[PDB]
């Protein structure tokens, strides 16, 4: 699993145990992401913070 970082020009290879790419958004997914990386489990959507996860190289 390669995941895109904040500028998706760049990517990192996920460490063992983390098989999701995520995008993190403030308030809305209709905005612009504020963080991009690897995670093990998509976090639940909070009232100010939102995530969309996928499981494919650079899908994020």
Residue numbers in the entry: 1 to 60
Sentences from the paper on this structure:
Cobra cytotoxins (CTs) belong to the three-fingered protein family and possess membrane activity. Three-finger toxins (TFTs) are disulfide-rich proteins from the venoms of cobras, kraits, coral, and some other snakes. Their fold features three distinct β-structural “fingers”, emerging from a globular core stapled by four conserved disulfide bridges. Cardiotoxins, or cytotoxins (CTs), are one of the largest groups of TFTs, affecting the integrity of lipid membranes, and/or influencing the activity of membrane proteins and the associated signaling cascades. For the first time, a spatial model of CT13Nn with both “water” and “membrane” conformations of the central loop (loop-2) were determined by X-ray crystallography.
Structures of hexagonal (with three molecules in the asymmetric unit denoted A, B, and C) and orthorhombic (with six molecules in an asymmetric unit denoted A, B, C, D, E, and F) crystal forms were solved at 2.3 and 2.6 Å-resolution, respectively. The electron density for molecules D, E, and F of the orthorhombic structure is considerably poorer than for three other molecules, which is also reflected in the higher B-factor. RMSD for Cα atoms of molecule A of the orthorhombic structure superimposed on the other five molecules ranges from 0.39 to 1.45 Å. Significant difference between E subunit of the orthorhombic structure and most other subunits could be explained by an unusual conformation of loop-2 in all subunits, except E. Previously, this was not observed in crystal structures of homologues. Comparison of subunit E with the NMR structure of CT2Nk (in aqueous solution) showed that the conformations of the loops were very similar. Unusual conformation of the loop-2 in all subunits of the hexagonal and most subunits of the orthorhombic form was similar to that found by NMR for cytotoxin 1 from N. oxiana (5NQ4) in DPC micelle. Superimposition of the models (except E) over residues 22–36 resulted in RMSD values in the range of 0.8 to 1.1 Å. Specifically, for model E the respective RMSD value was 1.8 Å. Superimposition of subunit E and A of CT13Nn demonstrated that the tip of the loop-2 was repulsed from the hydrophobic amino acid residues 8–9 of loop-1 of the neighboring subunit B due to crystal packing. For the first time, in this work the structure similar to the membrane-bound conformation of functionally important loop-2 of an S-type CT was observed in the two crystal forms.
